[PDB]
């Protein structure tokens, strides 16, 4: 999995774009809105929320009677498919971030029940804490998942108290019979995490997009002309009147690569037309850096044509493509203001012939497993047999190789690992360490990786404060000049990713190790709240202003973006990314060294 998106503007006539804008902003986005609303009020909805899997076909079932509707009719089939796919993905996400949140809440409740002090454990067990300690050592002799299973499995007060004592230290036997206030703060922190997860689980339903803003305009008339009767209704009117009038239709996900048919203009320019809309021809305006992808698209489609469809589109360097509208600055009709943009998702691994072989092996394994899975059932539907036929068709067609560039992949020395330490102040720090002999081959810092570019790092912090102030000075004036250094941060993290992967290449690394951070901006919020609740007992504003800057620094600390960028570059290059635990205490260099060493140690089994 090394999917990356390239983009290109699409240029055509004013009418060719009026057709698309009318056909999406007026018929496709309303279809997505109605599909979302219907998905919400479906009777099985609360069942889906219990799982993370919305059923495979439900969204299409609510769409089949919707295609013939008076206000949703007059669309290509592969665009009803776009709407179905968008809504299905929205609710495939929304049922996976609420199921895992519920799992976290359940686990945190179990841990809150787990947590007892030394005195509390003594009074519950009815024995001296020394017996608790001895039995806890005994049970540690007989990871944490096993202990939680043991606790949830037994009903004895003594054994369960032993589990509690063990997991209080984290499968450790610490004999420092002190710091009861520390336990009080820890229990307070766990309770705050419980409260925050509960506050999260009451989430808004997927909104959808209202381009017409009919509700806004109607509510303005209701609020001005009439008078509300209670506060709870005037508040709803106010909330509606302040909502954001979105003005961009949903994209068009074309999950089939061939739905975009490519051609060469009489001027040599590349051109696209999509399945269902062939009278609409769009001319590709890319940049030369992205030219080879589009030329590969045209060459691959022509190569499939010239073999009488003996070649499997499915090894195409194109996987799918969104067809979005950007936002333009100025005035005029929307088709003349917003720039149509094609976002093609390409499997970079397929560019080389050698990587194409890897992709071929992956697909030929997964799809023959699919064939075996369908061959056990005896239902033998007709379209099910059509699917079975297509699977063997892809099997047969996959062994016909297109002519692609050749690069002998990347032979990686398994010993030499790369450990990356992230931090609030040192965004990254890399240690190239050989595992056979623990001596680090090399160290680099945030000034070494950003060489000649290190000035950016300071300029990121110098102005992200400045912009943070400028926004504040413009909000009170209600000017739209709210700017932020998100692009600068993204550029800096991309530079770091390139530097780290280049360093791994130079020393012939066999892996890259990144820490598993977990919920990092939440644990610090909980800890700061717990500390401020004693530092400020009854003053909530004081509990908030306490460690404000530290918390906002954590929240804007983009560990996830940096990890994703490094993962993208390593996958593009072939470095096998692993994971480890960042040591809690230590210098960044030692942190990275021990991180990579631990990753190597755990990998061995």
């Amino acid at each position: 999995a090394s999917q990356i998106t390239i983009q290109a503007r699409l240029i055509s006539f004013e009418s060719n774009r009026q057709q698309l804008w009318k056909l999406m902003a007026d018929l496709n986005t309303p279809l997505i809105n109605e599909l979302l609303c219907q998905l919400g009020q479906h009777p099985d909805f609360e069942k889906w929320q219990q799982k993370g899997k919305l059923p495979s076909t439900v969204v299409s079932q609510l769409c089949q009677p919707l295609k013939t509707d008076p206000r949703f009719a007059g669309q290509p089939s592969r665009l009803y498919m776009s709407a179905i796919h968008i809504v299905d993905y929205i609710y495939k996400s929304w049922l996976a971030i609420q199921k895992r949140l519920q799992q976290q809440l359940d686990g945190k409740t179990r841990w809150l029940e787990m947590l007892n002090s030394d005195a509390e454990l003594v009074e519950l067990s009815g024995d001296t804490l020394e017996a608790i300690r001895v039995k806890a050592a005994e049970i540690l002799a007989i990871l944490s998942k096993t202990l939680f299973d043991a606790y949830q499995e037994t009903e004895d007060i003594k054994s369960r108290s032993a589990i509690s004592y063990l997991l209080k230290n984290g499968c450790k036997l610490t004999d420092k019979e002190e710091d009861s206030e520390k336990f009080a703060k820890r229990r307070r922190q766990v309770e705050i995490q419980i409260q925050r997860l509960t506050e999260k689980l009451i989430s808004r339903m997927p909104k959808g997009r209202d381009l017409t803003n009919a509700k806004w305009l109607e509510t303005l008339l209701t609020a001005t002309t009439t008078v509300a009767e209670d506060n709870a209704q005037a508040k709803r009117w106010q909330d509606i009147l302040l909502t954001r009038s979105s003005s961009l239709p949903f994209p068009l996900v074309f999950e089939t690569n061939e739905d975009m048919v490519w051609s060469k203009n009489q001027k040599g320019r590349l051109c696209v037309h999509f399945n269902g809309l062939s009278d609409l021809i769009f001319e590709v305006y890319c940049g030369n850096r992205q030219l080879h992808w589009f030329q590969r698209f045209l060459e691959d489609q022509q190569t499939k044509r010239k073999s009488k469809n003996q070649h499997s589109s499915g090894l195409f360097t194109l996987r799918n493509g969104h067809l979005v509208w950007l936002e333009g600055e100025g005035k005029g009709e929307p088709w003349n203001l917003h720039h149509l943009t094609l976002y093609c998702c390409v499997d970079n691994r397929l560019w080389t012939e050698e990587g194409t072989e890897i992709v071929r092996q992956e697909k030929a394994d997964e799809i023959t497993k699919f064939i075996t899975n369908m061959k056990k059932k005896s239902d033998l539907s007709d379209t099910q047999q059509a699917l079975i036929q297509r699977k063997q068709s892809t099997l047969t067609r996959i062994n016909n190789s297109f002519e692609r560039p050749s690069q002998p992949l990347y032979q990686g020395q398994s010993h030499i690992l790369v450990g990356v330490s992230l931090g609030l102040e040192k965004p990254a720090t890399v240690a190239v360490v050989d595992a056979i002999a623990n001596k680090v081959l090399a160290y680099r810092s945030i000034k070494q990786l950003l060489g000649d570019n290190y000035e950016l790092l300071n300029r990121q912090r110098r102005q992200q404060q400045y912009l943070s102030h400028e926004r504040h000075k413009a909000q009170k004036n209600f000017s739209p000049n709210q700017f932020g250094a998100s692009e600068l941060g993204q550029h800096i993290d991309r530079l770091l990713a390139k530097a780290i992967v280049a360093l791994a290449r130079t020393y012939k690394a066999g892996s890259i190790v990144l820490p598993k951070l977990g919920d990092m901006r939440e644990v610090v919020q909980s800890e700061i709240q717990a500390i401020a609740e004693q530092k400020f007992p009854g003053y909530i504003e004081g509990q908030q202003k306490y460690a404000k800057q530290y918390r906002v620094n954590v929240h804007r600390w983009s560990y996830g973006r940096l990890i994703q960028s490094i993962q993208s570059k390593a996958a593009q290059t072939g470095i096998v990314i692993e994971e480890g635990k960042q040591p809690i205490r230590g210098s960044p260099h030692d942190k990275a060294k021990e991180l990579a060493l631990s990753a190597y140690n755990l990998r061995l089994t």
Binding site: T224, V227, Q238, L242, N477
Partner: protein, 85 residues
């Protein structure tokens, strides 16, 4: 709101010679401003700095109407009929 308009609306919602600030007059002023602003909001859909003002005027008029309703329902009804709210 223009001074001439305020004087005219005070006189035309007047209860006597000197009643500026009577709940009827305050509701009349707020209603006049909101009625002028609704067209501006039909046209300029980006002027949020006026959106906050509109919300404030709506809430002020709502409070005034509730107060006058609790005090004197008769005056409340005749007022809400005069303004057609």
């Amino acid at each position: 709101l223009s001074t001439e308009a305020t004087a005219k609306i005070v006189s035309e919602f007047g209860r006597d010679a000197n009643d500026t600030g009577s709940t009827e007059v305050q509701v009349a002023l707020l209603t006049a401003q909101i009625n002028h602003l609704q067209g501006h909001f039909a046209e300029h859909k980006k002027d949020h700095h006026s959106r906050r003002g509109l919300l404030r005027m709506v809430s002020q008029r709502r409070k005034l109407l509730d107060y006058l309703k609790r005090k004197d329902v008769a005056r409340y009804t005749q007022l809400i009929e005069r303004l057609g709210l």
